[PDB]
């Protein structure tokens, strides 16, 4: 369901239902959740890389999973939301490599990467509105923050099929590279992050995730609390030492 | 005060005080609110289109009555903010066609459109600061979200006169078209929306309005609740049926 | 520590530790805080201009004291966050002139300007992550609001050195000017602002600072309250009169 591979501190997760364009099912989500939990808890893992097998990243919800049964969407989203909670709370950087179609919840999941890359030919389609649904799996939370409300309105209400270049223009991805180079570039970035100050990355992500709903006073207090934690890490000491010694730091994520 | 026209499920509202550049008055606002309430309640109205008659969309608050008594802007806004509430809460898509000058409260009203088009030659000026006032009618809420804090600061504090092309770059509008084609383009878009899944549009708008103030967990919960609702609509059933039957869907807005 | 000089309603504050690239210390913060309070409380000061003496605006926190004792960043930040509270709360416009390197907390401080100008050659580096720290001094609050979450993620996690031109494209600054003409242009803008409706500027800033955490209803209510206040100022009366009389207004900040 989800392939797992480790390389130099990087846990590579590959959605694996290629014949179905990695369409999402409860089984896939449970496997993805288990993989994220393992990655989050494995001290050897300093970074994660998420991508899709085959021609697409993920076409979103597999409509065949419903069959002829009646919609029970509020409950059905339980598996999606726990995966989103896990992604949002990762205490390690996540790189996402969008290799092809990313639509619906597939797009929602792709956008949770801290650093995102798309291959030439990849596309982003909100898609939900096309079948009379609303954005889910955190897309209504992430999209406005990532591309601004003006573009979020257009993307969600009109559901255009965005090219990789258009995604780069809006901030949906940070880089666009030739299809045959996507994974090498993404993995190279993930390995660099895997050598970085993991706790700083983790705590920085927490600040960003909670910043919009906080007053400046509350934000300053949170920065104080989290900086206090970061300041006590062995990595911070190493960081200061390396700077003074005019040498590269050797971080260990603690 | 406000002209009301109907066409293929689209309620077209035109601010009608061209001789005064559609200056905003309490009379105009009550008329707009009445029309919005009517459109919102009319099940046959699947979309709305708002534009201005004459040379401008709206030059903002009419200052004629100033000096007549002690300026009570708090009382005035508390009384008319219901118009903004109504605009933002429309359970159907709103298209705005900016035919010319949009300033002050005129700019505020124009920015409430879900999809916004501007005619070549149209302009956007925050204007409030020029007469010692702060942005109102939702502008302080919408501007930062639509164009980002950096640009909002500049536009509000310096109040430059933005061209239609500049507005497009900032995200104030989604499209710029020849003045003689503005209404044709806007109505075409509105009619397309009036054939779409109105409930999905409505609920998606609800999610966007709350996106920044909710925690991720609260957002995921609201998404699940609204998807549960959307999933029960006739439109969703049709959307899935049409997809499986490789044919176009025939949405009814329920 | 901090140079102070008044000029035509403008209080010019210059970080003064050029030999140390204006590296931030508690002593420097205490001086800046005192200067900010003075400008805030001085009714004759209607605009402030912040810049750095020497080749750099500020390279951020001075790491000289590190090692002397157990790192206590929460205590330190809780003690000096009052400086950021003061900056953000100024009831008058603040212009920032970034003359060179702005990194770490130096970047945090520069971004608090309402209108920001950078000299050709100036740069912006988040820097915190390079020594295993999280963004502080309000940077985690300001950055995503100013440039959006997508860009903020990239700037904070990878900490690239941003040129003045790239900072301009993103919105980190509103204008770029020759290094030799920076202060001239910055001071000119500040003096212009010092002639503007100070109360309108003050209340507008308040709305912007609090906008993201508020529901639309709360935002509309706050706009009503603050507009009521602005509407009572003599500057508003002058504003309306000047508009009717088709003449430039003569604001006094009251």
The per-residue DSSP string of chain B comes to -EEEEEETTEEEEEE--GGGTT-B-HHHHHHHHHHHHHHHH-TT--EEEEEESTT-SB--B--TTTTSS---HHHHHHHHHHHHHHHHH-SS-EEEEE-SEEETHHHHHHTT-SEEEEETT-EEE--GGGGT----TTHHHHHHHHH-HHHHHHHHHH---EEHHHHHHHTS-SEEE-GGGHHHHHHHHHHHHTTS-HHHHHHHHHHHHHTTTS-HHHHHHHHHHHHHHHTTSHHHHHHHHHHHTTS-------
* Strand partners of residue C95: C49, C115
- Cα–Cα dist C154/C171, whole Å: 15
Instruction: Determine, for residues C227 and B154 on separate chains, whether the beta-carbon distance falls below 8 Å.
Output: no
Q: What homologous superfamily is domain B1-196 in, according to CATH?
A: 2-enoyl-CoA Hydratase; Chain A, domain 1 (3.90.226.10)
8-state DSSP, A215: -
- Cα–Cα dist A124/B131, whole Å: 44
Cβ contact C106:C24 at 8 Å: yes
Question: In this structure, what token pair is assigned to residue A197?
Answer: 């100050």
Specify the long-range contacts of residues A237-245, CB closer than 8 Å, at least 24 apart. Answer: A237/C71, A238/C132, A239/A197, A239/C130, A239/C131, A239/C132, A239/C133, A240/C63, A240/C66, A240/C67, A240/C131, A243/C63, A243/C130, A243/C131, A244/C63
Numbered ranges of CATH 3.90.226.10 in chain C:
1-196
Question: In this structure, what token pair is assigned to residue C210?
Answer: 């609090």
Question: What are the two backbone dihedrals, phi and then psi, of residue B100, each rounded to the nearest 5 degrees?
Answer: -170, -130
Instruction: Determine, for residues B131 and C171 on separate chains, whether the beta-carbon distance falls below 8 Å.
Output: no
CB pairs under 8 A between A and B: 150
- Cα–Cα dist C86/C81, whole Å: 9
- Cα–Cα dist C22/C36, whole Å: 17
- Cα–Cα dist B16/B21, whole Å: 9
b/e code B62-71 from CB counts within 10 Å (16+ = b): bbeebeeeeb
Question: In this structure, what token pair is assigned to residue B168?
Answer: 């497009």
Helix, strand, coil percent values for chain C (each to nearest 5): 50, 15, 30
What burial class does residue C50 get, using C-beta atoms within 10 Å of its C-beta: 0-12 exposed, 13-18 middle, 19+ buried?
Answer: buried
What burial class does residue C44 get, using C-beta atoms within 10 Å of its C-beta: 0-12 exposed, 13-18 middle, 19+ buried?
Answer: exposed
Which of B138, B154, B212 is nearest residue C220 as measured by Cβ atoms? Answer: B138
Token pair 């998807």 is at which residue? Answer: B227
Other residues' Cβ atoms within 10 Å of the Cβ of residue B223: 28
Mutate to test the interface with B, among C195, C224, C244, C253 (most CBs of B within 10 A): C224
Annotated resolution, angstroms = 1.9
Distance from CA of A64 to the nearest CA of B (A): 10
State whether residue C216 sits within 8 Å of chain A by CB.
no
- Cα–Cα dist C122/C167, whole Å: 9
The second-level CATH assignment, the architecture, of B197-254 is Orthogonal Bundle (1.10)
Cβ contact A74:A226 at 8 Å: no
Cβ contact B128:B156 at 8 Å: yes
Numbered ranges of CATH 1.10.12.10 in chain A:
197-254
- Residues of chain B in contact with residue A138, where contact means CB-CB under 8 angstroms, are 216, 219-220, 223
For residue B253, what are the CA distances in angstroms to A65, A155, A248? 25, 20, 61
Which of C114, C171, C224 is nearest residue B157 as measured by Cβ atoms? Answer: C114
Rounded to the nearest 10°, the torsion over CA A149, A155, A157, A161 is: 180
Segments in chain C forming alpha helices (H): 26-41, 73-89, 105-110, 139-147, 149-158, 164-170, 182-193, 198-210, 216-232, 234-244
Instruction: Determine, for residues C146 and B141 on separate chains, whether the beta-carbon distance falls below 8 Å.
Output: no
State whether residue B148 sits within 8 Å of chain A by CB.
yes
Distance from CA of A229 to the nearest CA of C (A): 8
Residue of chain C with shortest Cα separation from A112? C150
Rounded to the nearest 10°, the torsion over CA B36, B37, B38, B43 is: 100
Instruction: Determine, for residues C240 and B73 on separate chains, whether the beta-carbon distance falls below 8 Å.
Output: no
Instruction: Determine, for residues C220 and B144 on separate chains, whether the beta-carbon distance falls below 8 Å.
Output: no
Which of C63, C75, C138 is nearest residue A220 as measured by Cβ atoms? Answer: C138
- Cα–Cα dist A189/B32, whole Å: 54
Specify the long-range contacts of residues A217-221, CB closer than 8 Å, at least 24 apart. Answer: A217/C85, A219/C138, A219/C140, A219/C141, A220/C77, A220/C81, A220/C84, A220/C85, A220/C138, A220/C141, A221/C78, A221/C81
Question: In this structure, what token pair is assigned to residue C3?
Answer: 């140079």
- Cα–Cα dist B60/C1, whole Å: 47
Cα end-to-end span (Å), chain A: 32
């Amino acid at each position: 369901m989800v392939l797992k591979e480790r390389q130099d501190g990087v846990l590579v997760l590959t959605l694996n239902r290629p014949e179905k364009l990695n369409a999402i099912t409860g089984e896939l989500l449970d496997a993805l959740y288990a993989a994220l939990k393992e990655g989050e808890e494995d001290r050897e893992v300093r970074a994660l890389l998420l991508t899709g097998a085959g021609r697409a990243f993920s076409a979103g919800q597999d409509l065949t999973e419903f069959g002829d049964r009646k919609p029970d969407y509020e409950a059905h989203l339980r598996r999606y939301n726990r995966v989103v909670e896990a992604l949002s709370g990762l205490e390690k950087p996540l790189v996402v490599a969008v290799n092809g179609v990313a639509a619906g919840a597939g797009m929602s999941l792709a956008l949770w990467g801290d650093l995102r890359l798309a291959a030439v030919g990849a596309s982003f389609t909100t898609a939900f509105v096309r079948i009379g649904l609303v954005p889910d799996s955190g897309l209504s939370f992430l999209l406005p923050r990532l591309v601004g409300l003006a573009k979020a309105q257009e993307l969600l209400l009109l559901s255009p099929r965005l090219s990789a270049e258009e995604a780069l223009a809006l901030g949906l991805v940070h880089r666009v590279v030739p299809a045959e180079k996507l994974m090498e570039e993404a993995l190279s970035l993930a390995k660099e992050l895997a050598q970085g100050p993991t706790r700083a990355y983790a705590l920085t992500k927490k600040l960003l995730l909670e910043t919009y709903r906080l007053s400046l006073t509350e934000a300053l207090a949170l920065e104080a609390v989290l900086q206090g934690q970061a300041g006590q890490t062995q990595d911070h000491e190493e960081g200061v030492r390396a700077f003074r010694e005019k040498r590269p730091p050797r971080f260990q994520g603690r």
